[model samples]
Target: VTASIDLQSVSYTDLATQLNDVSDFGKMIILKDNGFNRQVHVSMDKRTKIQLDNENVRLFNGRDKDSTSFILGDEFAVLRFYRNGESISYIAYKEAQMMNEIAEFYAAPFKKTRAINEKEAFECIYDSGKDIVSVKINIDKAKKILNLPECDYINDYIKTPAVPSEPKTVYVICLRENGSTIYPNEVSAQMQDAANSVYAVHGLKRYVNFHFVLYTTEYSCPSGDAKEGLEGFTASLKSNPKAEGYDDQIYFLIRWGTWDNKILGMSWFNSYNVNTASDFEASGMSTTQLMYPGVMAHELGHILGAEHTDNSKDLMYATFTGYLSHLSEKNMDIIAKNLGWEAADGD
Candidate 1:
């Protein structure tokens, strides 16, 4: 049976802070009844407006139909219930405004304490410290980017594989932007290339799923404003896995940026032994469709759990030179061992 949800009067309000100017808040909506076991997913038409970098429309996983109560992240201090389950559900429909006020009134410290620090430590130092010294010699920007926490949770977790599951579907997340750097056509080309790359390596033909959204603001990606932009981008990346609802499969986030010394592309790995690299540069071509397909393959080699191949021609190398359509035998070996698949799986 189907039912309707009615949002009544908004009861309380609070305010909080995020990053610089933007403020976050929440509220309470009194409903006729409660106890919704049904899964309610919160969707935002304009995700950029939310003050919290960690904000998302929460999905309530309530229990029974007559429970007369649902829960939000402890924002509601006390919950009152009615007898006979005549539920008066106090749902926080658009309570963000209310919460923002409360957060401000109370001078909430949760948001400020979580600020990212941009300092280059051993964690950010890589490539024989060449990139480190180079950045220091040239622009202090890299030092700032490196220092602001290397997305350690995402970066490190990408290398740690989940226990083997029945070859679940593979998911590829492509970033599309209306702006010049992130053209939609580029995102489409990159997605196809990534799918083909995965197929070539393990003889494993997998599906590529993509979702795109435009960045309303000019984001200094892959490095700049590492604090706000990185947090937002990372949050968007997590939204991908959730969007497709694929739990047991592999996932990837691809982006194209111009940092000169940091030119081109990169993907994080999903396991320890697969192909994974942080960035890919353009050589012999500029457009995404041309030679970057191999870059996609090369980068996926990291996410698929491959390592840098000393063979300069291999896609698993540290850098991308040209068309890398071929998968080396050693690369194939790693795939077979990891996925327990035979050599012919890709065909």
Candidate 2:
């Protein structure tokens, strides 16, 4: 693929940051506007070779000899290289400085974390001397403890409304777990806001009544060591007198705790299969004073079968940006399938 590196308005520090960002996703870096039709791409693999000196500088791809080359890297110099279906270019910088920038880029830290409720719940880290971002949940242990079936896909246990009808009611149970607490009316109001956001979109075709109830459970934290923490949390719900005997109800659990101190929320995308109830979905939230109505809405979207998108402005993006006021057509389709819809003939 063609890579373009543009440095017209970017500083060297910014360039280093950009390079590190691209590498994080395991993609080649493309420089923009080096005064040539060619693009510049940096491969993170060891096959690439670099040579630099005051008189000459060259970068050679192990597989392609004519891939890229640089000379007299300076603040004002621009360089470009071309090959079959691949191009590389750079905004002027000294060869030594460029090498240093590349070195620092590779030395950056990497981290990935997941809550125990997630499908592939695990913790991975590199370059950071601290612990993994989260406690690792054991999938096998969780399944056995929760009495869940082998869920291969999220749709495996999901139920779709076969006929269009009135709005369906989904009972929301707000569990104050591990001593985390919400005010008398704060949880209710925030949950109502989340439900409103969901209804505004799905109401156009179908309806969902988000009925919320809060239970103040015993103060016991989940295990910090392994997946037992997740299962323990779920198993403990039985101790709550208010949560008993609701086989017919569609329930979503909102467990409150200060998890990892960094993750704001989490949910099982395919919670229907693993939970004790067929229609059970659960999400966890960090203990924060800041109102997270948007987070609640976004997490609920995932439980209802919405996937992430490239639109950073949308709620389902990897990061929450508060700009997601609507759902994509694909997400609407999946959500509508589970809720009652109006007849097309009526319109």
Best by lDDT: 2
lDDT (10s digit) by residue, model 1, range 1-347: 32223222222221111011112332223233235233222211111111112222111212223332222222331122233322222222124554344323222322333224322211111122222110001012222333422121112213321223333333333333225343232333343444445545554433222222223322224443323333444445445444444333333333453223333444444342212312221101112432243555555565555666566656565655443444567666665455445444443
Clashes of 2: 16
C-alpha RMSD between model 2 and the true structure: 19.6
Clashes of each: 40, 16
* Poorest lDDT segment (10 consecutive residues) of candidate 1: 131-140
The global Cα lDDT (0 to 1) of model 2 is 0.40
Q: 75, model 2: CA deviation in Å? A: 63
lDDT values of the candidates?
0.33, 0.40
The total of clashing pairs for model 1 equals: 40
Off by over 4 Å in 2: 1-165, 204-206, 223-230, 238-242, 247-257, 272-288, 342-347
lDDT of 2 by residue, 86-160 (tens): 222333232444434432332221123233544222212111233221111222333333442221111111223
**What's each prediction's TM-score?**
0.38, 0.44
Best-performing candidate as measured by TM-score: 2
Error of 2 at 269 (Å): 0.9
For residue 239, model 2's alpha carbon misses the true position, in angstroms, by: 6.4
